[PDB]
Structure 1
Amino acid sequence: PELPEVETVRRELEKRIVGQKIISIEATYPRMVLTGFEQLKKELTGKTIQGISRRGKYLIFEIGDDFRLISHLRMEGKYRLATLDAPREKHDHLTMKFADGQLIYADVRKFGTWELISTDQVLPYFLKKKIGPEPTYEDFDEKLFREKLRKSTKKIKPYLLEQTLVAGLGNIYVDEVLWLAKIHPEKETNQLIESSIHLLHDSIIEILQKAIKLGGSSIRTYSALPSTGKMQNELQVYGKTGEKCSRCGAEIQKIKVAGRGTHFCPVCQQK
C-alpha cells in the first residue's frame, strides 16, 4: 500500500482497537519482528492500545505509555479484525488477541516488518530513515522542495519514490501525480522550471488527499482491511496501458524506469 491506503487502515483500526487490552500475541512467522518476537510478546502482552499514528507509509501502534510498534506493510501486507475462532489463512503471520476479537497481520511476500521501540525513540527512528515531510500544505514546504530539485540530476520519478523529498508516494500515485502535473517520469529534476515545480508540489498534496478521502485505491477486492476504496475509479494512467488519456486522447504508454513499471501520456508528459 501507499500512504492513502495506510492512512485508511490507520483510521479504521483507530475506531476499533483503541482501548483494547492485548490478551496474548502469537506468531507463525516470528522473524518479521525485527526487534525480536519473544521480546515483543513479553513486553506487550497485557498492555492496552492507546492510539494509532502514521508517518509516511509506516503505521505506529501506541501501546501502553511507553511502547511504539512500527509496522510497515511493504507490498502486500494486510491487517484484519477477526473473531477469536477465525480459521487460519495461509499467509497469516502474527496476531494480537483481544477479549472479543483479534488483529491478524498477513503478508504473502513476507516483506512487511514490525519493530518495537520506545516513545522517545520514534522521532530518531524516522530521522535515521531520512523520511521527508508529510504531503500536507503545512508540512511540505515548496521552497525546500524546489531547492532540492534544482541541485539534482536524478530523474523525477525515482527521486520522488525515495520518500526523501516528500513521504508517501509509491508506484501508483507517483505515476498519477506526474500525469496530473504534466511531467515526464524520466525528466532530470534540475530541468524543472519553477511553475512546473509548483504544480507538482500542489498535485502531490491534492492527489494524496483525494485518495485518502476516497479510502484508497483497491486494485483488487480483498477479505481484509481496508474496506473497498473508490480511488481506483479516478486513476488516469496507472495500469491504463493502451487506453486513451482523458485530456488529449493519446494512448497511455508503459515503460520501465529505474526498474519500475511506469505509465504516462506521451503527449501531456513531454520527454
Structure 2
Amino acid sequence: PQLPEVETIRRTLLPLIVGKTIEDVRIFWPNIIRHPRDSEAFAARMIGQTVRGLERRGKFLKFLLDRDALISHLRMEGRYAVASALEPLEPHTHVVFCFTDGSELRYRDVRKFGTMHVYAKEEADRRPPLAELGPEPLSPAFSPAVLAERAVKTKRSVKALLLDQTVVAGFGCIYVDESLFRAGILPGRPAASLSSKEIERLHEEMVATIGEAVMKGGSTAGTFQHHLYVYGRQGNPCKRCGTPIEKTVVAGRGTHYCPRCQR
C-alpha cells in the first residue's frame, strides 16, 4: 500500500475504532513487533488505553491512544479489519487488539512483512521509522525547491529518487511510474540531469496523481486502476500516442513507461 491506499484505510478505519478501550493484545507473529522489541511489553503497555485517533504519515498508520502512539507499516500485504470476538479468525491474522466491547481490531499480513512500533506520543515523530521521513506530498512543505535540492545532489535515477521516503513520503512503484509518465520524463534519467522546468512539471504531476488517487480510494475498493497510463500495461498501446508501453528494470525494480511520451 502507498499513500492513497493507506489514507483510505485511515478514513474508513477511524470511525470503527475511535473511543474503544483495549482490553487485550494478542500476538501470533512477534517479528512484526519492532518496538518494544519484547512483544510482551508491547502487549502490556497498551492494555487499558483508548483509541483517540488515527493519522497517516507517509505510508504509515499512526494510532493515537492515551499516552502512546502505535506506528503501523503494512508493507506489501498488511490489512486491518474490525470484527466480533465471537467469530473465528481469518487466516494469516498475526496481531489482534481486543476491545472491551467485544469487538477486535485484526491485523492480517500473508507475507509477514509489516511492522509495529509503540512509543510515547511525544517520542513517535523523533524516533524510527517516522523521524527520517520527507515532507507530505500534499503539503506546502513539498515544493519544487525541495525536490530540486535533493535531485542536484545525486547521480541516481529519478525513479530511485522518488521512491526514497526521506525525499518525500508516500510514493511507490505504481504512482512513481504514473507521475513520471504524466510529466513526460523517462524513469531512468539521472536525477541531476533534470532541468528546472522538468522539476516543476514533475512536482505538479506528483501532487496531482497522488491527489486523484486519494479521491478515488486508491488502486486495487479503489478505482484509480482505470486511470493508469503505464503501470502494468506493458505491451499495450499508450493511451495518448498508441506506442506500446515498455517494461524494463530501473534501480532493480520493474519499471513501466512510454518511450515516446517520456523523454
TM-score w.r.t. length of structure 1: 0.92
Deviations 1:232-266 (A, max 9, x none): 11111111111111111100111111211111001
Look up the match of 2:226.
Answer: 233
Matched, 1:13 2:6: no
| TM superposition score normalised by structure 2 | 0.95
User: Percent of aligned positions with the same letter in both sequences?
Assistant: 41
State how far apart, in whole Å, the 2-side matches of 1:198 and 1:153 are.
19
Is residue 167 of structure 2 the alignment partner of residue 165 of structure 1?
yes
Query: Aligned to 1:124, what secondary structure does the other structure show?
Result: coil
The amino acid of 2:228's aligned partner reads L
Q: Distance in 2 between matches of 1:37 and 1:137?
A: 35
Query: What is the match of residue 254 of structure 1?
Result: 247
Cα contact 2:180–2:187 (8 A) shared by 1: yes
- Return the offset for 1:129: 4.4
Q: Measure the CA separation in 2 of the matches of 1:126 and 1:41.
A: 19
Aligned-partner Cα distance in 2 for 1:16–1:77: 18
Q: Which residue of 1 aligns with 2:189?
A: 187
Where 1:154 maps in the other structure, the secondary structure is: coil
- Counterparts of 1:30 and 1:173 in 2: how far apart (Å)? 31
Deviation digits for residues 205-235 of structure 1 (CA, Å, limit 9, x no counterpart) = 11111111111101xxxxxxxxx11111111
Find 2:49's aligned residue among 38, 47, 50.
Answer: 47
Distance 1:232 1:97 in 2: 35
Match of 1:130, SS? coil
Contact 1:137 1:205 in 2 (8 A): no
1:111 match: 113
Give the stretch that moved more between structures: 165-174 or 123-132: 123-132
Q: Matches of 2:199 and 2:210 in 1, distance apart?
A: 17
Does structure 1 residue 122 correspond to structure 2 residue 115? no
**CA positional deviation for 1:108:** 0.9
- TM alignment of 1:17-36, pairs within 5 A: 17-34=17-34, 35=36, 36=38
Which consecutive residues of structure 1, in runs of 5 or more, have no partner in the other structure? 219-227
Verify: 1:96 aligned to 2:97, yes or no: yes
**Whole-angstrom distance in 2 between the partners of 1:63 and 1:149:** 38
Task: State the AA in 2 paired with 1:245.
Answer: C
